[PDB]
Structure formats: structure tokens, C-alpha cells
Amino acid sequence: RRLKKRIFAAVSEGCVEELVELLVELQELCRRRHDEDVPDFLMHKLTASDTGKTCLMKALLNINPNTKEIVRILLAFAEENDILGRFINAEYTEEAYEGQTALNIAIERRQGDIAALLIAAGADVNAHAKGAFFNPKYQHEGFYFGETPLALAACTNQPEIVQLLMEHEQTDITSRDSRGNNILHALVTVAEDFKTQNDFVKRMYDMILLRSGNWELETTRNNDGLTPLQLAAKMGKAEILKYILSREIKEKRLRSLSRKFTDWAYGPVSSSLYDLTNVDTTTDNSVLEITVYNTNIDNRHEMLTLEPLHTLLHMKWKKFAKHMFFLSFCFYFFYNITLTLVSYYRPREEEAIPHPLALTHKMGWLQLLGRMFVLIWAMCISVKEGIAIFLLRPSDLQSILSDAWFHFVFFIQAVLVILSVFLYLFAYKEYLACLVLAMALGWANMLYYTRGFQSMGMYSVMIQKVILHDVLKFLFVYIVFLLGFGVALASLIEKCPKDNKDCSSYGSFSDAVLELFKLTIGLGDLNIQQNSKYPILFLFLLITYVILTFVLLLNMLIALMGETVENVSKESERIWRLQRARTILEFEKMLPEWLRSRFRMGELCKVAEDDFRLCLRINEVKWTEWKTHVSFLNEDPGPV
Amino acid sequence: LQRARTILEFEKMLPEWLRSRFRMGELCKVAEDDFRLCLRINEVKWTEWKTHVSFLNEDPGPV
Numbered sequence: 001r002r003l004k005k006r007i008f009a010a011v012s013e014g015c016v017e018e019l020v021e022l023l024v025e026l027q028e029l030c031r032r033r034h035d036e037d038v039p040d041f042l043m044h045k046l047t048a049s050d051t052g053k054t055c056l057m058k059a060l061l062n063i064n065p066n067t068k069e070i071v072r073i074l075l076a077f078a079e080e081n082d083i084l085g086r087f088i089n090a091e092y093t094e095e096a097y098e099g100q101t102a103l104n105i106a107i108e109r110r111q112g113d114i115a116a117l118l119i120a121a122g123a124d125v126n127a128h129a130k131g132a133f134f135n136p137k138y139q140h141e142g143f144y145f146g147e148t149p150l151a152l153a154a155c156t157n158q159p160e161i162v163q164l165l166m167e168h169e170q171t172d173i174t175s176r177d178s179r180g181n182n183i184l185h186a187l188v189t190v191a192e193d194f195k196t197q198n199d200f201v202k203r204m205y206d207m208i209l210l211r212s213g214n215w216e217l218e219t220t221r222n223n224d225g226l227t228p229l230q231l232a233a234k235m236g237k238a239e240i241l242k243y244i245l246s247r248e249i250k251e252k253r254l255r256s257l258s259r260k261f262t263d264w265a266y267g268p269v270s271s272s273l274y275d276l277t278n279v280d281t282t283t284d285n286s287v288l289e290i291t292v293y294n295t296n297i298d299n300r301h302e303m304l305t306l307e308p309l310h311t312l313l314h315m316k317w318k319k320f321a322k323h324m325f326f327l328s329f330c331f332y333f334f335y336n337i338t339l340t341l342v343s344y345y346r347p348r349e350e351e352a353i354p355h356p357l358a359l360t361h362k363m364g365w366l367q368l369l370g371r372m373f374v375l376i377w378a379m380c381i382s383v384k385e386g387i388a389i390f391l392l393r394p395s396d397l398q399s400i401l402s403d404a405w406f407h408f409v410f411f412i413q414a415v416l417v418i419l420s421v422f423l424y425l426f427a428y429k430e431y432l433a434c435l436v437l438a439m440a441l442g443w444a445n446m447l448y449y450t451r452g453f454q455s456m457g458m459y460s461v462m463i464q465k466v467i468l469h470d471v472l473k474f475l476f477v478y479i480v481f482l483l484g485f486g487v488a489l490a491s492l493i494e495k496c497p498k499d500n501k502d503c504s505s506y507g508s509f510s511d512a513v514l515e516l517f518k519l520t521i522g523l524g525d526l527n528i529q530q531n532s533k534y535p536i537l538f539l540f541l542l543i544t545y546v547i548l549t550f551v552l553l554l555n556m557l558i559a560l561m562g563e564t565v566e567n568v569s570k571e572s573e574r575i576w577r578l579q580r581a582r583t584i585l586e587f588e589k590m591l592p593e594w595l596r597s598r599f600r601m602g603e604l605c606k607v608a609e610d611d612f613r614l615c616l617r618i619n620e621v622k623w624t625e626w627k628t629h630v631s632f633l634n635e636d637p638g639p640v
Numbered sequence: 641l642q643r644a645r646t647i648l649e650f651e652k653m654l655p656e657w658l659r660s661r662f663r664m665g666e667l668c669k670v671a672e673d674d675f676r677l678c679l680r681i682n683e684v685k686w687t688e689w690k691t692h693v694s695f696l697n698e699d700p701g702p703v
């Protein structure tokens with residue numbers, strides 16, 4: 001084009017001597033041009049007209065030893081022509097970079113010196129790169145950081161640029177974006193575990209919060225209605241949680257920005273106070289509630305190890321959840337005994353016209369009481385579990401097994417009763433089959449109530465794992481052999497002579513499959529003479545079945561469990577507290593308002609001037625790094 | 641490894657026309673007059689930051 005493409009090259013390969021000669025020619029064209037269409041024209045020449053890109057952008061996307069000199073010349077040239085208000089603050093247009101600017105490029109490309117120049121020249125420090133690349137939908141579609149220059153410098157570990165932007169006086173640190181996320185929401189979004197990144201996101205989290213000096217940021221809710229604290233519990237960032245939930249700011253004049261407070265300390269003994277503002281379930285969407293009910297993450301059982309939550313679970317147990325767990329046991333325990341006895345001691349003779357659970361002929365005070373309590377408590381589970389199964393809305397398959405299995409069996413156990421209670425006086429005679437399943441299901445379910453005890457609870461966690469990792473693999477392969485060798489052995493058995501009808505026990509498929517099952521469990525006798533056409537061939541398939549099943553698969557099953565027990569034993573305690581935590585909160589959601597208030601946690605403490613907060617007292621003993629206790633709330637240690 | 645053997649044995653059976661459409665990689669210009677077939681893989685690395693000087697396209701992202 002004889003003006004355009006010659007400049008975009010000169011800024012790229014580091015061509016100073018050429019670039020100067022190009023911009024002089026760019027003036028000579030304009031000395032003939034009027035003094036009104038200068039600014040609108042110079043932009044179209046230093047602009048690509050399809051992407052919105054300019055030459056200051058192209059200069060910084062291609063870094064070189066002469067970048068910093070190209071920036072001096074171009075920004076200088078913008079000054080004489082009076083275009084240093086839209087040239088430095090130019091943005092893309094296409095679809096996926098809408099809002100990205102030269103400052104946005106300088107910060108990522110790690111030119112803090114050039115970034116300082118652009119801000120001094122009047123670069124907008126509050127741009128919003130809102131393009132699709134800057135708001136992906138699949139990580140491995142792009143990169144999200146919060147759309148702001150301050151968030152990029154923080155999310156990319158550039159502390160010197162992060163400090164420079166905050167000191168600038170127009171930097172709106174409290175700015176929100178398309179997702180509603182401010183600077184702190186975005187750091188929670190990009191955080192990762194320590195082996196992946198480093199602890200720098202935690203350090204940027206501290207630096208920006210202290211420099212601000214208020215609770216405005218952590219109080220801000222995003223478009224989904226979430227604070228940075230709630231957002232961390234949802235997305236699963238334990239390292240950032242452990243920082244917030246136990247934050248100490250020793251610097252008086254910033255101590256009110258804390259959540260951990262040293263009430264008193266005398267030597268190695270200390271007493272800390274943990275704020276419970278939006279952690280306890282007094283509010284709608286608390287940290288505790290997210291931690292227990294978030295089925296989208298796979299590290300919940302690490303979260304309830306954090307001290308304010310862990311102590312908070314233990315106290316809810318000591319006060320009301322332990323006692324309710326004992327009552328729920330007793331009502332469900334006598335519930336199954338009643339199902340047992342109305343059934344086992346039914347009127348078998350007379351063809352059982354006065355069905356069990358009838359509420360019929362006269363009375364007797366055990367005959368009447370029992371049959372009422374069942375049909376009521378049957379409906380009570382069905383409604384409760386009917387609601388409960390509907391709320392969580394099973395999305396994936398790992399959740400119902402890991403969070404909801406016992407909820408279904410009680411739904412099934414309750415409906416089988418009610419299915420029976422219909423079929424008694426209304427329809428066919430299969431009511432009995434539904435009632436016998438209800439109790440055998442009912443009695444085996446009692447492993448649920450083991451979880452009040454740690455020892456039996458951890459034991460129950462391992463039963464769950466060993467079934468899903470070992471048994472279902474085992475049962476599948478065993479059946480392909482059991483039915484395969486079964487029909488093969490049954491296919492050989494001749495018709496019995498009419499003299500002896502019972503010439504063989506493999507006379508059919510169902511007969512052979514049963515007898516092979518008997519061998520595996522060690523029950524019965526084994527006669528090789530079975531009226532077969534090919535006896536040595538008949539023995540061959542049988543002994544073959546023994547070697548695969550008796551020698552290999554059964555004993556192999558024991559060996560694979562030992563591998564399961566070894567790996568799972570290091571995690572069964574924390575998974576137990578997760579299931580236990582779910583039990584405590586479900587009890588807690590049932591209690592009325594007046595009974596909820598008296599069992600409210602924490603005591604009201606004065607952590608600062610006119611800042612009365614509810615906190616949790618936890619005592620500690622520390623011997624290692626002694627210090628002079630300067631920060632505290634009460635100089636007289638001890639209670640009261 | 642066993643799975644890889646299964647994939648290739650299937651692959652040796654397919655006809656020519658059906659082999660071509662399921663051909664892998666996209667044709668990219670890695671250098672001057674050097675058009676090669678390559679495989680795109682995305683990565684995320686946080687540890688050793690640097691100024692990205694060597695690349696093929698200054699406009700990131702697909703297309």
C-alpha cells in the first residue's frame with residue numbers, strides 16, 4: 001500500500017533507523033492534508049482496519065532488544081499530532097479481544113518499565129478485556145483472569161506491577177466484571193494447589209487486601225451471589241480457605257481486617273477467636289453448607305479438617321446431633337421389630353385374610369399400637385426421602401453412591417411397605433414378597449447407624465469401597481465362567497434311561513449352574529459319573545472350572561482387597577467425618593427456630609472498636625517459636 | 641500397550657478412502673515454505689514465567 005505495511009514491519013524486527021524515516025514521510029503526507037482531518041487520518045494509518053490492532057500493540061506482541069526505543073518514538077510522535085488520548089487507549093474490536101489494550105499486552109509480556117511509561121502517558125488502568133478468549137468456557141479454550149490490568153499482574157505473579165497500579169490514584173480496585181467478579185474473586189478462580197503453582201496467589205490475596213483497608217471487597221457478591229469466601233468453598237481451593245478462615249493481621253491499624261484474634265496468651269498457652277460471620281449455618285449459603293453438600297469437587301474431606309469448621313462440627317454433635325442420632329436409631333429400630341413380628345407371627349392358616357398391618361378386630365394394646373406406628377413412620381420416610389431424593393437431583397453416578405446411597409434404600413424400604421399395604425385388601429397375593437424384602441432390606445440397612453461411632457464408622461466406609469473396587473469386578477468375571485462352563489457341561493448329558501430318571505445333576509442349564517455354584521461355596525457332594533458321553537472331557541471342563549474359580553479368582557480377590565485396604569485406610573477417618581457432617585446438618589435443618597437459637601454457637605466478643613462479632617474460642621499450646629505477646633484483646637489471661 | 645495394538649490392527653483394516661478422512665493433524669506453516677502436518681496440544685504452566693518471544697501467531701486462541 002506504500003504507507004501501511006512498511007510501519008508494522010519496522011516496529012516488529014527492531015528497525016529504528018527505518019521507523020524514523022517512515023514517520024517523517026507520515027508527516028509529509030499530512031503537511032498537504034488540512035489541519036482538521038489529521039487525527040482521524042493518522043489513526044487509520046496506524047490501525048489495521050479489520051482487527052483494531054495498532055502499531056504500539058504490534059510493537060509489544062513482538063518483543064525485541066529495541067522494543068523500548070520503538071515505544072519512545074511512537075508515543076513521542078503521538079504527542080506532536082495530539083493523538084495521545086486514543087492511540088495509547090486503543091482497543092481491539094473483532095470478537096475475541098474486545099477490550100484488550102497496549103497496557104494489557106505490556107503487562108503479560110513482562111515489560112514493567114514500558115508499563116510504567118504507558119501509565120505515565122495516560123493509559124487507562126481500568127480497561128476490561130471482555131472478549132471470548134478472555135472469558136472462555138473450557139480451560140484449554142483460553143485464559144480468564146478478571147479482565148482488568150490489576151488482575152492480570154496479580155494472576156501472573158508480577159508484584160512490582162501490582163504495586164504500581166494500586167498506587168495510581170484512578171485504579172478502581174473495587175471494580176467488577178462480566179462475571180461479577182472483583183479482584184479477589186478472580187484470584188480464587190486461578191488458584192491451585194501448592195505442587196502446581198506456588199503460594200503466590202495467597203500472597204497476592206494478602207497484598208491487595210491490606211492496601212485497600214476495608215471489608216468492601218470480601219463483602220462483594222458476584223452475579224451468582226457469592227463472596228470470595230463462598231466462591232472458594234464452591235470451587236475447591238483449600239489453601240485460600242485456610243488463609244482466610246485463620247487470617248492474622250498483627251499490625252494494629254489493620255487488626256480489624258482479621259478473622260483470627262488472640263484473646264489472651266501467657267507463655268506457650270494461647271486462646272484464639274475465630275469469626276463465624278458467614279461460616280456457621282445462621283445464614284443461607286454458608287461455608288460449612290457448601291463444604292458438605294458440594295458434589296462437584298473431590299476434596300471435601302480435607303476441608304472439614306480446617307480448625308473453625310472441625311471444632312464447629314464437634315460442638316453440634318455434643319449438643320443436639322448426638323442425641324437425635326440415638327433417637328432416630330430407636331424409632332427405626334423398633335420400626336423393624338414390628339415389621340418382623342406381624343409378619344413372622346402372621347396368621348398363616350385361614351390363608352391369612354386378616355393381613356398383617358390391618359387395624360382391625362378389637363384391640364390388645366400391643367397388637368394395635370405397633371401396627372399404627374409402622375404405617376405412619378413408613379409414610380414419614382417416604383415423604384422425607386421423597387423430598388430428599390428430589391432436591392439433590394442425581395446428576396452423575398458417583399454422587400448417589402458417595403452421598404446418597406442410604407437415602408434410596410429407605411425410600412425403597414418405605415415404598416415396599418406402602419406397596420404391600422395397598423396389595424393387602426385390594427389386589428393380588430404378592431403383598432408378602434414386598435413385605436419380606438422390606439425387612440431384609442431394613443435389617444441390613446442398620447450399618448447406616450454405625451456412623452455415630454468412629455471405629456464402626458471407618459469400618460463401614462471400607463465395606464462401601466471394597467464392593468465397588470473388588471466385588472463387582474469379581475462377580476462379573478465369575479458369572480461369565482459359571483454360565484459358560486454350565487451350559488457346556490449340561491450340553492453333554494444324555495437323556496436319562498427310563499429306569500432311573502435321576503441319572504444326573506447336570507441334566508439342564510439351571511441344574512448345572514446351581515451345582516457349580518454349590519462347588520464354589522463348598523456345599524454338597526460331587527459324583528463324576530453323570531451319564532455323560534465323554535467322561536474324560538467331562539472331567540476336563542469341571543476341573544478347569546475349579547482352577548479358575550477355587551484356585552485363582554477367589555484367592556486373587558483377597559489379594560486385591562489388601563491393596564484397597566492399604567490405600568483407603570489413610571482416608572477413611574476423614575471420609576467418615578464428611579458423612580457424619582452431613583448427618584449433623586440434616587438434623588440441624590429440622591429443628592425449629594426457638595430450639596435452633598439456644599444451641600447457637602459462639603460467644604459475642606469485642607474484637608475492635610464498635611465491632612462486636614460472634615467468634616469461637618479454641619485453646620492452643622505452642623512451645624517452638626517463642627515471642628513477646630504484643631497483640632491481644634485482654635491483658636488478664638484465663639477465663640472470665 | 642495392549643489397547644494400542646488393538647487400535648492399529650483396526651487401522652490396518654480400513655480402506656484408503658476411509659483412512660484419509662480419519663487422518664490426523666492439521667497442515668500448518670511452521671517456517672518459510674515448510675508446510676507440515678502437526679498435532680495441537682494445549683498446556684498450562686505457572687512456574688517459570690518468561691517473555692514469549694518465539695511463536696507462530698501473535699493473535700492467540702483458535703482461528
Ligand SMILES: CCCCCCCC/C=C/CCCCCCCC(=O)O[C@@H](COC(=O)CCCCCCCCCCCCCCC)COP(=O)([O-])OCC[N+](C)(C)C
Pocket residue numbers: 319320323324325327328331380381384406407410448586587590591592595
Ligand atoms: C425440646 C425437645 C424437642 C422439641 C420438639 C422439636 C422437634 C424437632 C423435629 C424434628 C423432625 C421430626 C419429624 C421427623 C423427620 C422425618 C425423618 C424421619 O422419619 O426420621 C427422623 C428421625 O430422627 C430424629 O431425630 C427426629 C426425631 C425428633 C428430634 C428430637 C427433638 C429435637 C432435638 C432435641 C434436643 C436434644 C438435646 C437436648 C440437650 C439439652 C430423622 O432421622 P434421620 O436419620 O435424619 O433420617 C432418616 C433417613 N436418613 C438416614 C437417610 C437420613
Ligand SMILES: CCCCCCCC/C=C/CCCCCCCC(=O)O[C@@H](COC(=O)CCCCCCCCCCCCCCC)COP(=O)([O-])OCC[N+](C)(C)C
Pocket residue numbers: 475476479480483484487508509510511513
Ligand atoms: C450381571 C453381569 C454378568 C454378565 C455375564 C452374562 C453371562 C455371559 C455368558 C453366558 C453363557 C450363556 C448361557 C445362557 C444361554 C443358554 C441358555 C439356554 O440354552 O436356555 C435357557 C435360558 O435360561 C434360562 O431359562 C435361565 C434359567 C435360570 C438359570 C440361570 C440363572 C443364572 C443367573 C446368574 C446369577 C446372577 C444373575 C443376575 C442378573 C439377573 C433355558 O433354561 P433351562 O434351564 O433349560 O430351563 C428349562 C428346563 N428346566 C425345566 C429344567 C428348568
Ligand SMILES: CCCCCCCC/C=C/CCCCCCCC(=O)O[C@@H](COC(=O)CCCCCCCCCCCCCCC)COP(=O)([O-])OCC[N+](C)(C)C
Pocket residue numbers: 533534535536537538540
Ligand atoms: C486332560 C487333558 C490334559 C490336561 C492338561 C491341560 C493341557 C492340555 C489341554 C488340552 C485341551 C483339551 C483337552 C481335552 C481332554 C481330552 C478329552 C477327550 O479326549 O475327549 C474325547 C475326544 O474329544 C475331544 O475333543 C478331544 C480333544 C480335541 C482337541 C483338543 C485340543 C485342541 C486342538 C485343536 C486344533 C487347533 C490347534 C492347532 C495348533 C495351533 C474322548 O474322551 P472320552 O470320551 O472321555 O474318552 C472315553 C472313550 N469313549 C469316547 C469311547 C467313551
Ligand SMILES: CCCCCCCC/C=C\CCCCCCCC(=O)O[C@@H](COC(=O)CCCCCCCCCCCCCCC)COP(=O)([O-])OCC[N+](C)(C)C
Pocket residue numbers: 337338339341342345366367369370371
Ligand atoms: C437384639 C437383636 C434382636 C432384636 C429383636 C427384638 C427381640 C425379639 C422379638 C420378640 C420376641 C419374640 C417372642 C414372642 C413374643 C412376641 C410378642 C409380641 O408382641 O408379639 C406380637 C408383635 O407385637 C408387636 O409387633 C408390637 C410392637 C412393639 C413391641 C414388640 C415386642 C418386642 C419389643 C422389645 C424387644 C427387645 C429389643 C431391644 C430393646 C432395646 C404379635 O405376636 P404374638 O402372636 O402376639 O406373639 C406370641 C406368639 N407365640 C405365642 C406363638 C409365641
Ligand SMILES: CCCCCCCC/C=C\CCCCCCCC(=O)O[C@@H](COC(=O)CCCCCCCCCCCCCCC)COP(=O)([O-])OCC[N+](C)(C)C
Pocket residue numbers: 400401402403405412437440441444445447448460461463464465467468
Ligand atoms: C428392594 C430390593 C432390596 C434387595 C436387598 C434386600 C436385602 C438386603 C441386601 C442388601 C443391602 C445391604 C448391603 C449394604 C450394606 C450397607 C452399605 C455398604 O456396606 O456399602 C455399600 C453397599 O454396596 C452397594 O450398594 C453396591 C451395589 C449393590 C448392592 C447390592 C445390595 C443392595 C441393592 C440390591 C440391588 C437392587 C437393584 C434394583 C433396582 C433399583 C454402599 O453402597 P454404594 O453406594 O454402592 O457404595 C458406595 C461406595 N463408595 C464408598 C465408593 C462411595
Ligand SMILES: CCCCCCCC/C=C\CCCCCCCC(=O)O[C@@H](COC(=O)CCCCCCCCCCCCCCC)COP(=O)([O-])OCC[N+](C)(C)C
Pocket residue numbers: 317322325326329446447449450451452453454455456
Ligand atoms: C443392630 C445394629 C445396630 C447399628 C449399629 C450400631 C453401632 C455399633 C455400636 C457400638 C460400637 C462401639 C465402638 C466403640 C466406639 C469408640 C469410638 C467412638 O467414636 O466413641 C464415641 C462413642 O460415644 C458417643 O456418644 C458417640 C455415639 C453415640 C450415638 C450412637 C447412637 C446410635 C447407635 C447405637 C448403637 C448401640 C446398640 C447396638 C446394638 C443394637 C465417643 O464419643 P464421641 O462424642 O463420638 O467423641 C469422639 C471421641 N473420640 C474419637 C476421641 C473417641
Ligand SMILES: CCCCCCCC/C=C\CCCCCCCC(=O)O[C@@H](COC(=O)CCCCCCCCCCCCCCC)COP(=O)([O-])OCC[N+](C)(C)C
Pocket residue numbers: 454455456458
Ligand atoms: C456370635 C457370638 C458372640 C457375639 C458377637 C458380637 C460381637 C460384638 C459385640 C458387641 C458390640 C461391639 C461391636 C464392635 C465394636 C468395635 C470394636 C472396637 O471399637 O474395637 C477397637 C478396640 O478398642 C476397644 O476399646 C474395643 C473394646 C470395647 C468392647 C469390649 C468388649 C465388650 C463387647 C462385647 C464383645 C466381647 C465379648 C465377645 C462376645 C460378644 C478398635 O477400633 P479402632 O477403630 O481401631 O479404634 C479404637 C480406638 N483407638 C483409636 C485408640 C485405636
Ligand SMILES: CCCCCCCC/C=C\CCCCCCCC(=O)O[C@@H](COC(=O)CCCCCCCCCCCCCCC)COP(=O)([O-])OCC[N+](C)(C)C
Pocket residue numbers: 397468469471472473475476479
Ligand atoms: C450375582 C447377582 C448380581 C450380579 C453380579 C455382577 C456384578 C456386576 C454387574 C454389572 C457389570 C459391572 C461390572 C463391574 C464394572 C467395573 C467396576 C468399576 O469400574 O469399579 C470402579 C468403581 O466402581 C464403579 O465405577 C462402578 C460403580 C458404577 C456402577 C453402579 C452399579 C451398576 C451396575 C450393577 C452393579 C450394582 C448392583 C448389584 C447387582 C448387579 C473402581 O475402578 P478403579 O480401577 O478404581 O477406577 C474407577 C475410577 N477411578 C479411577 C476414579 C477410581
Ligand code: NA
Pocket residue numbers: 521522523
Ligand atoms: Na468348605
Ligand code: NA
Pocket residue numbers: 521522523
Ligand atoms: Na465344605
Ligand code: NA
Pocket residue numbers: 522523524
Ligand atoms: Na461339605
Ligand code: NA
Pocket residue numbers: 562
Ligand atoms: Na500387604
